[PDB]
Amino acid sequence: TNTRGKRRGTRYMFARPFRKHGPIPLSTYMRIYKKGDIVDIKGTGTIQKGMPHKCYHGKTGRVYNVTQHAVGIIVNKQVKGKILAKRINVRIEHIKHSKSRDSFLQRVKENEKKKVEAKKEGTWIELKRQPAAPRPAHFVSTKNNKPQLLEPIPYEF
Amino acid sequence: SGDAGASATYPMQCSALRKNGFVVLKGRPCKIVEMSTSKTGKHGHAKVHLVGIDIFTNKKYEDICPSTHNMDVPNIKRNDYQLVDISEGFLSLMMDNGDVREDLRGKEIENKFAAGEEMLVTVLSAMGEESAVALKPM
Amino acid sequence: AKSKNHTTHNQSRKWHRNGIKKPRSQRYESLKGVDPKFLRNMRFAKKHN
Amino acid sequence: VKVVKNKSYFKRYQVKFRRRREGKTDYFARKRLVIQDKNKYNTPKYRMIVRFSNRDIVCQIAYAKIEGDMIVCAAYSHELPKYGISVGLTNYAAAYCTGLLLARRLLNKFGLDKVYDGQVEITGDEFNVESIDGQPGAFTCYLDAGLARTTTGNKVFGALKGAVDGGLSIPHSTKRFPGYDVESKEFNAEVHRKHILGLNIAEYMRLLMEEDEECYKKQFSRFIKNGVTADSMEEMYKKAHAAIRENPVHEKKPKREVKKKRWNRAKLTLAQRKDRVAQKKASFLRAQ
Amino acid sequence: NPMRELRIRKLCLNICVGESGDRLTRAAKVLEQLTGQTPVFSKARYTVRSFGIRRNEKIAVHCTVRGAKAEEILEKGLKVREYELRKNNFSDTGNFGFGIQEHIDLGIKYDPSIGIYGLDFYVVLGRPGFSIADKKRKTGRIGAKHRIRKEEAMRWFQQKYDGIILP
Amino acid sequence: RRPARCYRYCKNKPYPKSRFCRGVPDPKIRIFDLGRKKAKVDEFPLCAHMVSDEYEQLSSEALEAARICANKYMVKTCGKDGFHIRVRLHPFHVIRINKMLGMRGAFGKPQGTVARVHIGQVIMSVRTKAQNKEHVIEALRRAKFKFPGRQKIHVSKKYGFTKFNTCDFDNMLAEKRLIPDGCGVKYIPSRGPLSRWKALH
RNA sequence: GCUUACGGCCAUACCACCCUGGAAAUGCCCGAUCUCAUCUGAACUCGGAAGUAAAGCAGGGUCGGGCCUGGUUAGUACUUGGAUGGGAGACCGCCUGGGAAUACCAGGUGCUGUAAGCUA
RNA sequence: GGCGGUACACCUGUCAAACGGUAACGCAGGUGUCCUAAGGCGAGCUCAGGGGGGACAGAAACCUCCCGUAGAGCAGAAGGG
RNA sequence: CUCGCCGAUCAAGCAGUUUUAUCCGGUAAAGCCAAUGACUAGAGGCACCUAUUCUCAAACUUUAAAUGGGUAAGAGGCCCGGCUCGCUGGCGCUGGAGCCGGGCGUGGAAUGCGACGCGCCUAGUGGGCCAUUUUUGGUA
Ligand SMILES: [Mg+2]
Ligand SMILES: [Mg+2]
Ligand SMILES: [Mg+2]
Ligand SMILES: [Mg+2]
Ligand SMILES: [Mg+2]
Ligand SMILES: [Mg+2]
Ligand SMILES: [Mg+2]
Numbered sequence A: 001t002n003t004r005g006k007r008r009g010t011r012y013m014f015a016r017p018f019r020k021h022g023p024i025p026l027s028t029y030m031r032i033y034k035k036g037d038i039v040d041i042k043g044t045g046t047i048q049k050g051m052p053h054k055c056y057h058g059k060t061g062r063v064y065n066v067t068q069h070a071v072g073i074i075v076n077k078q079v080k081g082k083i084l085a086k087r088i089n090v091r092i093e094h095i096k097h098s099k100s101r102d103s104f105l106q107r108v109k110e111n112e113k114k115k116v117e118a119k120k121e122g123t124w125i126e127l128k129r130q131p132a133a134p135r136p137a138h139f140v141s142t143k144n145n146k147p148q149l150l151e152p153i154p155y156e157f
Numbered sequence B: 001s002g003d004a005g006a007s008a009t010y011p012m013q014c015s016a017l018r019k020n021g022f023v024v025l026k027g028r029p030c031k032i033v034e035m036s037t038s039k040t041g042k043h044g045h046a047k048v049h050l051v052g053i054d055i056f057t058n059k060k061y062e063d064i065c066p067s068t069h070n071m072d073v074p075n076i077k078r079n080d081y082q083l084v085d086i087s088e089g090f091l092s093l094m095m096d097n098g099d100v101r102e103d104l105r106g107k108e109i110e111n112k113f114a115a116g117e118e119m120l121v122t123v124l125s126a127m128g129e130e131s132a133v134a135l136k137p138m
Numbered sequence C: 001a002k003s004k005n006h007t008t009h010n011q012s013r014k015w016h017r018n019g020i021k022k023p024r025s026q027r028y029e030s031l032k033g034v035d036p037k038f039l040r041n042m043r044f045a046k047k048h049n
Numbered sequence D: 001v002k003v004v005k006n007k008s009y010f011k012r013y014q015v016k017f018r019r020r021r022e023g024k025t026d027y028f029a030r031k032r033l034v035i036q037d038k039n040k041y042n043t044p045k046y047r048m049i050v051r052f053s054n055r056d057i058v059c060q061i062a063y064a065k066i067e068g069d070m071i072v073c074a075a076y077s078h079e080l081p082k083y084g085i086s087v088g089l090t091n092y093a094a095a096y097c098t099g100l101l102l103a104r105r106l107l108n109k110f111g112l113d114k115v116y117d118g119q120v121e122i123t124g125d126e127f128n129v130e131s132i133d134g135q136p137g138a139f140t141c142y143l144d145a146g147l148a149r150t151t152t153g154n155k156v157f158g159a160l161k162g163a164v165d166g167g168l169s170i171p172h173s174t175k176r177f178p179g180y181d182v183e184s185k186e187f188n189a190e191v192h193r194k195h196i197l198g199l200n201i202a203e204y205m206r207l208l209m210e211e212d213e214e215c216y217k218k219q220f221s222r223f224i225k226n227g228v229t230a231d232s233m234e235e236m237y238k239k240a241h242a243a244i245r246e247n248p249v250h251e252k253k254p255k256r257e258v259k260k261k262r263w264n265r266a267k268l269t270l271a272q273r274k275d276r277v278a279q280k281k282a283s284f285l286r287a288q
Numbered sequence E: 001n002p003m004r005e006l007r008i009r010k011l012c013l014n015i016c017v018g019e020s021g022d023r024l025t026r027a028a029k030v031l032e033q034l035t036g037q038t039p040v041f042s043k044a045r046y047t048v049r050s051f052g053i054r055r056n057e058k059i060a061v062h063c064t065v066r067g068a069k070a071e072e073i074l075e076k077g078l079k080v081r082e083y084e085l086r087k088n089n090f091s092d093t094g095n096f097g098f099g100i101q102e103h104i105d106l107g108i109k110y111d112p113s114i115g116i117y118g119l120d121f122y123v124v125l126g127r128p129g130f131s132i133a134d135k136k137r138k139t140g141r142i143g144a145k146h147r148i149r150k151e152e153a154m155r156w157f158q159q160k161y162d163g164i165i166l167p
Numbered sequence F: 001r002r003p004a005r006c007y008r009y010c011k012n013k014p015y016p017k018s019r020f021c022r023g024v025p026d027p028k029i030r031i032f033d034l035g036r037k038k039a040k041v042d043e044f045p046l047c048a049h050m051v052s053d054e055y056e057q058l059s060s061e062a063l064e065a066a067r068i069c070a071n072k073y074m075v076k077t078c079g080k081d082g083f084h085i086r087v088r089l090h091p092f093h094v095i096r097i098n099k100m101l102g103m104r105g106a107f108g109k110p111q112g113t114v115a116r117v118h119i120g121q122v123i124m125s126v127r128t129k130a131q132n133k134e135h136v137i138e139a140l141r142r143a144k145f146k147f148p149g150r151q152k153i154h155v156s157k158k159y160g161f162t163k164f165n166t167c168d169f170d171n172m173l174a175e176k177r178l179i180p181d182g183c184g185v186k187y188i189p190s191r192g193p194l195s196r197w198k199a200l201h
Numbered sequence G: 001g002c003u004u005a006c007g008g009c010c011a012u013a014c015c016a017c018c019c020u021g022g023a024a025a026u027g028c029c030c031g032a033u034c035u036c037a038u039c040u041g042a043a044c045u046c047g048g049a050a051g052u053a054a055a056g057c058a059g060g061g062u063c064g065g066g067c068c069u070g071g072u073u074a075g076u077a078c079u080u081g082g083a084u085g086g087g088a089g090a091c092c093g094c095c096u097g098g099g100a101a102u103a104c105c106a107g108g109u110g111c112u113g114u115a116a117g118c119u120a
Numbered sequence H: 001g002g003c004g005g006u007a008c009a010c011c012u013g014u015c016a017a018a019c020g021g022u023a024a025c026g027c028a029g030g031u032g033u034c035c036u037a038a039g040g041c042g043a044g045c046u047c048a049g050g051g052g053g054g055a056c057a058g059a060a061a062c063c064u065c066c067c068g069u070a071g072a073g074c075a076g077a078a079g080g081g
Numbered sequence I: 001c002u003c004g005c006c007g008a009u010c011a012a013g014c015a016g017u018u019u020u021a022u023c024c025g026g027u028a029a030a031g032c033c034a035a036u037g038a039c040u041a042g043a044g045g046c047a048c049c050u051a052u053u054c055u056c057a058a059a060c061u062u063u064a065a066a067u068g069g070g071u072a073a074g075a076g077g078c079c080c081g082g083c084u085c086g087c088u089g090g091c092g093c094u095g096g097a098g099c100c101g102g103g104c105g106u107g108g109a110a111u112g113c114g115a116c117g118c119g120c121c122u123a124g125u126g127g128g129c130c131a132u133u134u135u136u137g138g139u140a
């Protein structure tokens, strides 16, 4: 049976990248985390204080509490067959802003301007994503690219 | 005040006891001279027979205990001191601090200091009290 | 008389039997665990408006 | 002897930060100085930057940002000739003025020059400005010594005293001001007033002029041609402090248009680079 | 050209006494009458029974002189060497050094109270501008065309002190 | 010892002799290069391999036996200074042996080293003159009977023990792109300092 | 374009050697009375301005090492899913999708934010 | 089964199949302590090793210059930093 | 039992599935001429030293898949005005959070489904065995 230590199996995840050791760059310390934004979790072996558990490294939750040096996150952790919302305290050196919702916010701001532009012009531009449709019918010209004959090559050892 | 400690000993299994070791028998450490174990039946258990010589004066002790039993093992530590004048009734020694201590008691040493050839004694501490046995020159 | 020690064979079939339900995210989340200095002032911003 | 700088050395080599390789920034002390608490939400954490060159003193006020910290106000030591101090632009007295010039100029652009005027008179005692109710709060920043060893009497604390006397609310103590007897653990403010007004400079001009005039001309050469004597030290800095409190605002120089004439040679292009080694090969085969 | 004068920075001297005790304490008095300043006790690093020393045991004394005192003592130590040194006494990086077996010829009378001691003179040669490697802020490197060489340090010894390099 | 039928297939992860595995006996094969090993590249142009066709593991005793079998045939047909054999398989996988017999604590002690081979990996390589082709193929053929599985005796197109073809090796010598150094060559690209280019000319 | 202060990214910025540059600025440099400081005014601290480019610094040079980027290696290695596929076996081929890495080759070598000053 | 062992309470690397989890009397190991500092903080400093040197002094004492991405050290096992 | 039942007249929400977007990892492979450790052979420069070479790692790795894990795809949104605070503070908005009012459906990926919605009581079971692939001890 394995040991129940808090840092068993974290030999590589809490390590630092090659030629990226040393002090933490001071941009991660001057990022503002409000209450209700989506943040990622990625532990760092440099700051041994307030580091998340290995069951949260790579997960993603929302912020519910902000303190002097850390941030309270609500992470959903599946234990056996149930998903539970965990309230964890992780310092700001192990987290970063999640760009998963920035593609949604940029898409909303572009939608709020497309309907007001179609309303004052009288068009019917559709505001809805669609999967990759089958390719339309197109002509393939062979004016300067004649089909080159391919054939299997003999076996050589 | 830092008089002394509280542990003063440690218990351990009886089968882990080795020959030429030390163990507590009848409330005093003894020098185990020989150990022999034997079975008891068909699916017999390891019956351990112990016999040890008391390190202080005399009165060899013995005891029977199973191998999976626990028995107290004392802390045997010996410290070295430098001899002083033993012309009084008690033997005098000095520690690293440089102060003298006179609590001990032999005949071959109490008069040796008056004729030269200084030596250093090794006082052995145990459960009950302290005593000096060995002597080596330099 | 040895037996089988550990297994997670039929567990995944039992989990998805009644489904793996995500935690119910309710509107107006709780306020337990928030900074006591922040909550003490927020209760003063509600008894004065 | 084995080579230490081989391919395996540079492949495993990780360089320090650029400001660390140049020896200008201490990132261990910068983190504990410019980083604001997370429960402040973009509250600017100001700091007073004091730097010393061989001929100039730089005093700046900045607050950290991700794309680089912004300088709110900057006062240099070469602006003192505008106020009267034309000599000794790097001594302790000139440090008290550029700190005072930074304090009064900052309070001017923030509309805080009427309130929090500080100590108009120089007494040397420990002075900390008080925030008066009803009025806007005092400006609270911090000192940034950098790589300068903070010993008793360092000129870094001269600009610190000049800023707290201008109106800035900087937390500090009189342990590192010149005049603190560490034996008795008491701060003699009268000694500090001498260093602020350059009275310790005057005693040097008198100890030399009354012992050997030859060395006085070498040590204070530009003090003789500018017409400043050992008896015109205390009054010169006093009237300089008065001019600083009157017009601390600094107007920028007119932007002089330049055609951008380059004085450095450009990098060799790929054509000039390959053609050069083509000529060396051809010239090498002719010689053999 | 004037900013390349091959001047002397410091003159290092030390007496490596066998062990601590009254013998080492009296050796420090020799450096007080010659240099004019209190030396420092250099304790040992590792214990070795072959030499009879232990760790953290004060073994040797040493002192450093910078200004004209460094030029005086260095000149007073070369008259014992007859103003001549060997060829291999120069290091491949400028500075060189020598040694004497008796300090009595160094302008100090032999006294029967304190025993006789022999120091070890080591002069660290320099050049105006080397302080850029010692200062904390804006610390930099010297350079190839500015650091001293062995051929440059030997000719300086032959011109200032009229020394003779024995091959 | 235990027959090779028990340690033929690569069943376990590689178990090399290291800090954790102590007490491994010395391998049976200790010499890997024979013949006139200190010969230049232009002396032995031909090259022939013994390519493996099975993903298995070859014992250290088999590598020792097949080396001597191929060596004794080359010294009688091509002389002791007319070839160069280079065994290209080092025994690094330590096979284990259980205690001499239940299975309480069945993890066994080391028994010996065995070289793991892949499909297409060269087992042995012999370089010689261009007229000794019929002798090397026969010498490497007799060594297959000391190995389990299936092997192929392929005459390589490379120039000796180098990694450059024979049709390009002579051209790269005139262009000073390859310089001989012992039994191999040095690939000199056109992207170094110009000082070493002038040394070649 | 340049010289400084504070930086962000943290080698396209580093490393070795060579060459050139001082308008402002910077650096070296000149002193130990005061503050402070060590064995030593070397460092640290402080006072100063005779010299102006030796070094720092900056800009160039190298069929430079490194680093960065791309090509190639290769649709190769490996892999999801499938078969009453082959084979004594080891293992291999195919169907349906994803798809690397070194070597080798080529190009590039700091960008940039705030504030102040100078047009070498 | 007994004897042995503790896989009975814990820790590191691996096994473990690139989230987490995952067994065997699987593998290599460690623990029942130590520390008024080896706790807290501030300041200064740069280590392991190698080269050239320097009375006695040598392969090992000490002084000093140069290179030195950490290859040292951080009480202990190992990993991370 | 609370609803939806009337289907996107409605808000919806959900998913052992894909798509779009954004993160996590250090296994296969690869590498060792890059570090740690192991390892064969010559060559050059005066045993080492430099540039090469053969062969490996489960408790090594610069690099690095496939499969896979988390999150985001709207009215609980977006935007605007006012107010409150003892918290925050150069800066009655300086941050922040709370409160109140107003404006704005082209429900703003595919497919499927009534919500496996909210509770209560609860028996049996807690010796499993087999196969494809992955894999440990073992000659098997
Ligand atoms: Mg374990
Ligand atoms: Mg069971
Ligand atoms: Mg069981
Ligand atoms: Mg079941
Ligand atoms: Mg190949
Ligand atoms: Mg010049
Ligand atoms: Mg290059």
Ligand SMILES: [Mg+2]
Pocket (backbone or CB within 6 Å): none
């Ligand atoms: Mg590439």
Ligand SMILES: [Mg+2]
Pocket (backbone or CB within 6 Å): none
């Ligand atoms: Mg144990």
Ligand SMILES: [Mg+2]
Pocket (backbone or CB within 6 Å): none
């Ligand atoms: Mg997995």
Ligand SMILES: [Mg+2]
Pocket (backbone or CB within 6 Å): none
């Ligand atoms: Mg809704």
Ligand SMILES: [Mg+2]
Pocket (backbone or CB within 6 Å): none
């Ligand atoms: Mg049970």
Ligand SMILES: [Mg+2]
Pocket (backbone or CB within 6 Å): none
């Ligand atoms: Mg039950």
